[PDB]
Design a protein around this ligand. Structure first.
Ligand SMILES: CCCCCCCCCCCCCCCCCC(=O)OC[C@H](CO[C@@H]1O[C@H](CO[C@H]2O[C@H](CO)[C@H](O)[C@H](O)[C@H]2O)[C@H](O)[C@H](O)[C@H]1O)OC(=O)CCCCCCCCCCCCCCCCC
Ligand SMILES: CCCCCCCCCCCCCCCCCC(=O)OC[C@H](CO[C@@H]1O[C@H](CO[C@H]2O[C@H](CO)[C@H](O)[C@H](O)[C@H]2O)[C@H](O)[C@H](O)[C@H]1O)OC(=O)CCCCCCCCCCCCCCCCC
Ligand SMILES: CCCCCCCCCCCCCCCC(=O)OC[C@H](CO[C@@H]1O[C@H](CS(=O)(=O)O)[C@@H](O)[C@H](O)[C@H]1O)OC(=O)CCCCCCCCCCCCCCC
Ligand SMILES: CCCCCCCCCCCCCCCC(=O)OC[C@H](COP(=O)(O)OC[C@@H](O)CO)OC(=O)CCCCCCCCCCCCCCC
Ligand code: SF4
Ligand code: SF4
Ligand code: SF4
Lengths: 189, 73, 204, 393, 145, 60, 111, 369
């Protein structure tokens, strides 16, 4: 009764053919171009909505507290003294602690004067934690532009690659996002 | 010229090739075709790293395989 | 006192390494611990998934030198990738204490810098991992994208390349060891491991 | 070396430091020779107190909090947190906002099943496509980053009036490109397990929850569907215009890890069909075409209508959760993520209970580890799709 | 591989304020900070974008106003001037203090000029602002910019 | 005094960029790099450009 | 099962240390003021912290030997250590490797 | 050398030219091939770590350990050097003698087994008439350092991991011995010079892989379970793996011993079942086609370099096959790998030994003499 000996050798040779096939198809993975976004020299561009570091304009601020009452932890320290010579609110030393911030930009949407805008800046690492307390002149700085650094080849991620492209590595020369924009169908139809 | 000295000369030439010359050629081949290489060519250049590895280790703190600064224009 | 939380004057400590051989060996030492930097595979919350997004193929974890380790004994670095609760905090201090002495901590996300969105109305969240561990680099962003984490790793490498080899001795613990006798009642172990074999699952 | 060798059953810790993507839970199992006799799961290492935080947060400032329970499909949490004051105040959503919600939730279901699928194949022993699953998950990340601003969790996308912002100018095209890319990948993932006898030997009869025992233990989602129950809350509750498409709930009859695998793979294959059928029937189509049609055709002609908007009356931050209570739910990637809201005409809720989809599936884990071996623990824990931020919350 | 001597400390003592150009991949300039610290200096490595209005943060008292998370009041904290508090709380026979700014990018030209003039005016204070970029570690004086 | 002032409307003309045909509001001018504010979307974005890739509009 | 309360600047460790091992004892508990040296710890303030710790462990008599009470003792000792640092009797280290000011930045007294 | 090239004879003769003894000249010659072989094993472990981190990256469509040297070339060296700099840990009641000796006992015979490997005819440390049998006997000392590293930690899950690794490491000694036994049948000896010399007759047709098609498979699968690799090794088996208490240079000893065992096993696949140094064309055929003698020193140098390249090509090919097969195969648990060791590789090794004995008795001109 050799029905379990030939089945044994059949299971062995089927596993051997499976290992040979999987070894042939893992050898076809080495020929593919690596999808690695090589960070310090290939900083990938964030999208047009990113919610990075919050930017603040000290002159466009009516010194309300809507940016505090919509923040989930009431984080922005806005303090004002009322000047009865002018009878306005007169902000002094706005600040946001970016070690406590969760970067939801609730304060950006519910800003009545469009004072708080959000940036593309995410490289905010510090050695001291208390350096993350950005005051009104610290967070009123112009953010780091990824496409204007002469050591970075910037990469559009997936939603800005035109209409058939999956990875932004083979891009020849700055091809746009997907196609037409609402200033085209107004000319079309 | 003595033939013992010529055998030592081809020993020194083979050592200078194995440690300095062809490791520099392998480095100049690897900042060259690495992505245009196939799987078999990748196995061949990995063999070239394997065989000339003491020469690649000697030449390692002197090559600067960082990307060049961009033009921004 | 006129300075509330003061710094203190040191004892004029200087190595004064006028030697250039030992300076280059210090360079080799700092480059070797800099370019290896094996982190602990430590998770606990949301941020770990972005940490896992570094270990994948789109952003590469290995191309700075660092492969994740399972045991803390082989771990060179710990990226605290999530919220530390009151329950997780002694476990985290234990797995930091189980590492060899040239060890580095990165407070990843707002939950380990200050306990970011749980710094207001939480009763069981440690407000910052630096209430437990000496932290080297702080990393903002609630889910900091993996470019920000391997920016924190770049700043950690800038921190590591400064470390002097004669300055080993800051890696100490400096015991104080005040022992006091107490009069508290010992309680039995409440959590033993008996879940289905406990004689209350079978019948009401 | 004070480890003796007894004849009594030992105890394996499997503590909160998991060296893989397993969360923070202890799994103190006994396992005398190999048979797991007892299993006490210790829970609460990520209990940060969302139910007590919620009582001191307005709903417009609790939306950044609700991504942190199921933090692989984050917007599903917003899909109940928005829907809880939506059905007290009776605020209607537009049709375009509802279809955008369906698209975001089905992309989140695909991403949640991908993040389950990576560690599950790594625990079962495949461990080759772990690095290939994060690539399509990064595709979903970059889709979410265009619209919602952030990646997989920290979206403020869902609002009481619908959706915070409409889609970008190239979003529908790239989402169709991702679906055309992703349709063969789920077939590859199914053939990885089912066309390999060692894996189906590892997954057959491992965890033998019954049909009625799954209903008694309160299991939901793919753990309930794999036991035999055709119970999807998108079909049971006529929820958020999911009935405008033609998809079939995937079920299996066994209830083991292979059945849960098959249900989750077919859930991916059905969710991508829902994505296609929602992108086709998007009111106004893509945002570039809809914005152009409401630009050139005056300020009229039904493209400025209510059901073609992204937001249904964008509300003030001082919106009062009115007096009354009910219990909303979604079918997330693990099914029955529910919110019990008892708001009492205050700006804050009075009680915000979170019914998590996998806190009630992790209580079956001692029952599922009864007659199993040691190396089948992490498979069974792999098949639950547990995420400890929802289990603890 | 580039056995660097102690020329960096000599260029620091010459210029007073030098802009570093570090490769962006990590720690290849901290060898110069360790060379600088071995000659008797005290380096103060801190991140530049966290500082705001360097005339006020470095040498003036500045109210920090930390984060109240909806619980405390405004509670202004008056931090001492960083350069003068770290210079007075120093050994009197030390070589001086060095501000090691690790993000010279995302700062203005006015702050660079102020940092150079600040290193010129008070005697023992040097800055090594890291404006980054270059393929090797190379430094210039903070003269033109 | 004639150069690019903060407070007006702009539109980008750099063709090989993610931000193309985008109208924005210029907010701050330091050292030539112009940072403009984009109202498009629920969150207001601030993206930095230079004067070599910007030009003001005449229509609005 | 070793009962302990390990945070920064205090370690409680209910038990006694032998060589480099702490053995879990019932009726004693140790104390490891600043095991990472963020503070300077002259002997006057060190004796003050030791006396405050013995007063705290005497006032905690009669309760359970849970980790909750050990964490309460360690947290009260943490508040005392921060009060000594705020009074000016204790300085920051400045020879450490981190220098992150885990108990507040330096600041002047009034303004 | 003039008549040939013999660096041993030339070194002993030129060291006797200073005024030393003959036995003292031999004693001073003695550390030089041993130091050369330790250099070969050290560059082999660095090549193995580099190839492991680069081919694994190329499989997963990543880029390997960049920014450490030009390519990732200095990536293993830093991974060596950092482990020299890290402190000790000593897990809480550890034995402090067996703990430090466990890595030493598990990596000393693997280094000692590098006498057996030739890179050419008399390009080795010693011929050693019981060569591969001594390699198998020395490789049998590994599940004593494994049990030593398991026991000397005061925690469990490493004692369990140590017993698990020792039960894995003895399940594949006997199929390894049977697969080497078939080659020792076909080679009429155990010395590796004689094993390669019975294959370097017709270049590539006299290689043992064509005459042992299943013996090569048994040896390769059994040697991939002795090196702790592939399926026979992402949550750990239980929580820990017999080396979760080793931190600095002792974990470095474990880490380098694994790859040194991998390089040695690949070299012995190249030596036993393939040509150890033989070109696929026989070398004396090229020597008679060139017309120059096979004893003049430049053809000696060219043939020695060609033999070293052939050895390193085949050793690299099997290291490459191991790094591919680490990501090819599914990871099997402990019971399936012990069933592969006892219930599959041992009966196939026994039936291979029986059929190669029948083939040597029946056709003795094809299988040895
Ligand atoms: C690792 C660190 C490397 C060490 C520092 C660099 C050294 C480089 C110098 C290489 C010397 C050439 C080696 C050689 O010709 O070895 C010769 C000598 C003597 O060998 C003699 O070789 C003769 C011929 O034998 C050969 O030929 C026989 C058939 O006739 C056999 O079949 C078999 O092939 C082989 O034994 C004799 O028979 C004896 O074997 C023996 O006397 O060996 C020896 O001293 C070996 C001494 C150590 C050599 C280690 C490096 C060699 C590997 C890299 C070589 C690459 C160079 C080419 C690069 C290509 C560039 C374009
Ligand atoms: C430091 C200076 C060392 C060089 C001294 C020469 C030497 O002592 O070395 C030579 C000696 C042997 O010397 C020979 O010795 C012969 C004499 O034989 C006798 O002597 C021998 C021992 O000397 C043996 O005992 C032999 O059995 C016996 O017959 C000859 O007469 C010659 O003197 C001479 O050729 O040992 C050897 O061959 C060593 C093996 C060298 C060849 C391998 C080089 C590979 C380099 C690339 C490494 C990167 C890849 C690593 C692997 C990666 C895998 C992925
Ligand atoms: C040889 C040992 C001499 C001592 C080495 C000092 C440390 C070198 C360093 O920091 O950069 C590290 C450089 C690599 O980058 C290198 O760094 C050099 C310096 S740089 O950016 O100006 O850093 C650069 O010139 C070079 O092109 C680049 O390859 O070289 C090394 O890796 C040195 C270690 C190799 C051998 C040690 C054993
Ligand atoms: C010559 C050898 C002759 C021995 C024949 C024994 C047959 C007797 C029945 C043997 C028998 O019945 O008991 C062996 C037993 C399997 O049978 P079971 O008893 O478990 O089956 C359950 C019974 O109820 C049904 O009979 O154990 C095993 O798992 C090992 C065999 C399967 C292993 C499958 C994998 C092995 C091959 C894989 C090869 C991979 C290497 C190639 C890689 C390139
Ligand atoms: S909401 Fe805007 S305007 Fe009001 S205080 Fe905040 S930043 Fe200023
Ligand atoms: S982004 Fe969110 S967390 Fe940060 S300050 Fe604004 S509202 Fe608060
Ligand atoms: S910082 Fe945000 S993403 Fe990170 S753990 Fe905390 S809540 Fe989760």
């Amino acid at each position: 009764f050799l029905n379990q000996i030939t089945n044994y050798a059949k299971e062995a040779v089927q596993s051997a053919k499976y290992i040979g096939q999987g070894l042939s198809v893992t050898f076809d993975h080495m020929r593919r171009r690596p999808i690695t976004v090589q960070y310090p020299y290939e900083k990938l561009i964030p999208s047009e909505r990113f919610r990075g570091r919050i930017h603040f304009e000290f002159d466009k601020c009516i010194a309300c507290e809507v940016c505090v009452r919509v923040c989930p932890i009431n984080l922005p320290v806005v303090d004002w003294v009322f000047n009865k010579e002018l009878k306005k609110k007169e902000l002094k030393h706005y600040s946001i602690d970016f070690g406590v911030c969760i970067f939801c930009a609730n304060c950006v949407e519910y800003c009545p004067t469009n004072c708080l805008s959000v940036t593309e800046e995410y490289e905010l690492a510090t050695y001291d934690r208390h350096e993350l307390n950005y005051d009104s002149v610290a967070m009123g700085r112009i953010p780091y532009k990824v496409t204007q650094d002469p050591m970075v080849t910037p990469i559009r991620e997936f939603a800005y690659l035109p209409a058939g492209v999956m990875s932004g590595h083979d891009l020849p020369a700055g091809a746009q996002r997907a196609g037409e924009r609402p200033e085209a169908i107004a000319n079309t139809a | 010229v003595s033939t013992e000295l010529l055998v030592l000369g081809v020993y020194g030439a083979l050592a200078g090739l194995y440690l300095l010359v062809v490791p520099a050629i392998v480095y100049a081949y690897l900042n060259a075709r690495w992505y245009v290489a196939s799987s078999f060519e990748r196995a061949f250049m990995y063999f070239l790293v394997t065989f000339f590895f003491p020469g690649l280790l000697l030449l390692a703190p002197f090559i600067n395989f960082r990307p060049q600064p961009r033009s921004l224009n | 006192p006129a300075i509330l939380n003061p710094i203190a004057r040191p004892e004029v400590p200087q190595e004064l390494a006028e030697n250039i051989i030992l300076t280059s060996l210090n360079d080799v030492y700092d480059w070797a611990r800099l370019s290896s930097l094996w982190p602990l595979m430590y998770g606990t919350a949301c941020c770990f998934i972005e940490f896992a997004a570094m270990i994948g193929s789109r952003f590469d974890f290995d191309r700075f030198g660092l492969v994740p380790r399972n045991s803390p004994r082989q771990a060179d670095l710990i990226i605290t990738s999530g919220t530390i609760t009151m329950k997780m905090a002694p476990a985290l201090v234990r797995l930091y204490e189980q590492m060899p002495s040239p060890k580095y901590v990165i407070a990843m996300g707002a939950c380990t810098i200050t306990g970011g969105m749980f710094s207001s109305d939480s009763y069981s969240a440690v407000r910052g991992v630096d209430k437990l561990i000496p932290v080297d680099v702080y990393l903002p962003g609630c889910p900091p994208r993996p470019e920000a984490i391997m920016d924190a790793i770049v700043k950690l490498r800038k921190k590591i390349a400064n470390e002097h080899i004669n300055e080993r001795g800051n890696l100490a613990q400096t015991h104080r060891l005040f022992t006091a006798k107490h009069k508290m009642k010992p309680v039995p172990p409440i959590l033993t491991g008996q879940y289905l074999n406990a004689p209350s699952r079978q019948a009401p | 070396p004070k480890i003796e060798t007894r004849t009594e059953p030992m105890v394996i810790n499997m503590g909160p430091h998991h060296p893989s993507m397993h969360g923070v839970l202890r799994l103190m199992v006994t396992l005398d020779g190999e048979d797991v006799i007892d299993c006490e799961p210790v829970i609460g290492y990520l209990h940060r107190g969302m139910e007590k935080i919620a009582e001191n947060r307005t709903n417009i400032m609790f939306i950044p909090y609700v991504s942190r329970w199921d933090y692989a499909a984050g917007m599903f949490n917003e899909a109940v947190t928005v829907n809880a004051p939506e059905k007290l105040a009776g605020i209607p959503v537009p049709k375009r906002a509802s279809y955008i919600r369906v698209i975001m939730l089905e992309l989140n279901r695909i991403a949640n099943h991908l993040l389950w699928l990576g560690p599950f194949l790594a625990d079962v022993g495949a461990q080759t496509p772990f690095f290939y699953i994060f690539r399509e998950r990064e595709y979903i990340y970059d889709l979410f980053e265009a619209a919602t601003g952030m990646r997989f969790i920290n979206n403020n996308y869902f609002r009481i009036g619908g959706v915070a912002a409409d889609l970008t100018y190239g979003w529908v095209t790239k989402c169709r490109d991702f679906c055309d890319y992703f349709l063969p990948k789920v077939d590859e993932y199914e053939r990885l397990i089912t066309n390999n006898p060692i894996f189906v030997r590892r997954l057959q009869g491992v965890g033998k929850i019954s049909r009625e025992e799954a209903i008694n233990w309160g299991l939901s989602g793919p753990m309930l569907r794999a036991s035999g129950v055709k119970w999807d809350l998108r079909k049971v509750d006529h929820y958020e215009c999911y009935d405008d498409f033609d998809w079939d709930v995937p079920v299996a009859t066994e209830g083991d890890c292979l059945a849960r695998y098959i249900v989750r793979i077919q859930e991916m294959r059905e969710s991508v069909k829902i994505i296609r059928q929602a992108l086709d029937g998007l009111p106004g189509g893509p945002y570039e075409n809809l914005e152009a049609k409401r630009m050139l055709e005056g300020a009229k002609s039904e493209w400025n209508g209510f059901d073609y908007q992204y937001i249904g009356k964008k509300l003030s931050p001082t919106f009062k959760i009115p007096k009354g209570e009910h219990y909303v739910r979604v079918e997330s990637g693990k099914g029955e993520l529910g919110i019990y809201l008892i708001g009492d005409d205050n700006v804050f809720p009075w009680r915000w209970k979170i019914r998590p989809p996998d806190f009630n599936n992790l209580q079956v884990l001692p029952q599922l580890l009864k007659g199993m071996k040691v190396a089948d623990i992490v498979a069974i824990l792999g098949s639950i799709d547990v995420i400890m931020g929802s289990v603890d919350r | 591989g580039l056995l660097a001597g102690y020329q960096f400390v000599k260029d620091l003592e010459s210029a007073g304020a030098l802009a570093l150009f570090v490769p962006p991949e990590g720690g290849f300039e901290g060898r110069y900070q360790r060379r600088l610290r071995s000659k008797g200096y005290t380096t103060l490595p801190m991140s530049a974008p966290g500082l705001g209005d360097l005339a006020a943060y470095l040498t003036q008292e500045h109210g920090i106003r930390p984060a109240h998370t909806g619980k405390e009041d405004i509670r202004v904290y008056f931090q001492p001037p960083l350069v003068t508090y770290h210079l007075e709380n120093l050994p009197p026979n030390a070589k001086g203090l060095v501000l090691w700014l690790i993000d010279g990018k995302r700062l203005s030209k006015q702050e660079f000029a102020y940092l150079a003039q600040l290193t010129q005016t008070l005697p023992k204070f040097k800055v090594v602002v890291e404006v980054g970029g270059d393929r090797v570690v190379r430094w210039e004086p903070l003269a033109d910019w | 005094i004639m150069t690019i002032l903060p407070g007006m409307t702009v539109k980008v003309t750099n063709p090989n960029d993610t931000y193309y045909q985008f109208q924005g509001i210029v907010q701050r001018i330091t050292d030539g790099k112009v940072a403009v504010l984009f109202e498009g979307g629920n969150w207001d974005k601030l993206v930095t450009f230079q004067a070599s890739e910007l030009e003001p509009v005449v229509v609005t | 099962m070793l009962l302990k309360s390990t945070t920064r600047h205090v370690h409680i460790y209910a038990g006694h240390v032998v060589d480099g091992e702490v053995h879990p004892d019932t009726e004693t508990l140790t104390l490891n003021v600043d095991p990472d040296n963020e503070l300077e710890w002259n002997e006057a303030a060190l004796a003050k912290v030791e006396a405050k710790f013995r007063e705290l462990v005497a006032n905690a008599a009669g309760e359970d030997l849970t980790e909750y009470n050990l964490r309460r003792i360690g947290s009260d000792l943490e508040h005392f250590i921060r009060s000594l640092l705020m009074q000016g009797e204790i300085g920051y280290n400045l020879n450490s490797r981190v220098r992150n000011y885990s108990l507040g930045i330096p600041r002047v007294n009034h303004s | 050398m003039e008549s040939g090239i013999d660096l041993q004879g030339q070194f002993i003769s030129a060291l006797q030219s200073l005024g030393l003894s003959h036995d003292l000249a031999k004693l001073l010659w003695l550390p030089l091939p041993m130091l050369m072989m330790l250099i070969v094993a050290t560059v082999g472990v660095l090549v193995a770590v580099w190839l492991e981190r680069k081919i694994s990256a190329a499989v997963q469509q990543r880029i390997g350990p960049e920014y450490i040297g030009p390519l990732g070339i200095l990536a293993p060296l830093a991974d060596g050097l950092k482990l020299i700099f890290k402190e000790d840990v000593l897990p809480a009641n550890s034995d402090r003698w067996l703990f430090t000796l466990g890595p030493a006992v598990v990596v000393i015979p693997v280094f000692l087994s590098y006498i057996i490997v030739p890179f050419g005819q008399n390009l080795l440390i010693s011929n050693l008439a019981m060569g591969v049998f001594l390699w198998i006997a020395l490789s049998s000392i590994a599940p004593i350092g494994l049990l030593m590293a398991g026991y000397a930690s005061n925690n469990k899950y490493s004692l369990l991991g140590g017993l698990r690794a020792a039960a894995q490491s003895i399940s594949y000694e006997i199929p390894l011995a049977l697969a080497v036994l078939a080659v020792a049948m076909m080679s009429n000896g155990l010395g590796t010079v004689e094993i390669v010399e019975q294959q370097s007759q017709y270049g590539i047709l006299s290689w043992n892989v064509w005459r042992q098609p299943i013996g090569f498979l048994v040896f390769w699968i059994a040697a991939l379970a002795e090196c702790e690799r592939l399926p026979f090794d992402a949550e750990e088996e239980l929580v820990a793996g017999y080396q979760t208490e080793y931190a600095g240079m002792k974990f470095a000893l474990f880490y380098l011993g694994a790859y040194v065992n991998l390089v040695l096993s690949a070299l012995l696949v190249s030596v036993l079942y393939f040509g150890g140094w033989s070109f696929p064309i026989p070398l004396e055929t090229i020597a008679n086609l060139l017309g120059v003698s096979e004893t003049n020193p430049f053809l000696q140098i060219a043939f020695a370099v060609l033999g070293i390249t052939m050895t390193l090509i085949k050793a690299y090919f099997f290291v490459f096959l191991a790094i591919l097969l680490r990501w090819t195969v599914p990871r099997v648990r402990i019971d399936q790998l012990l069933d592969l060791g006892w219930k599959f590789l041992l009966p196939v090794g026994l039936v291979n030994l029986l059929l190669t004995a029948g083939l040597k008795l029946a056709f003795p001109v094809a299988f040895g003499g």
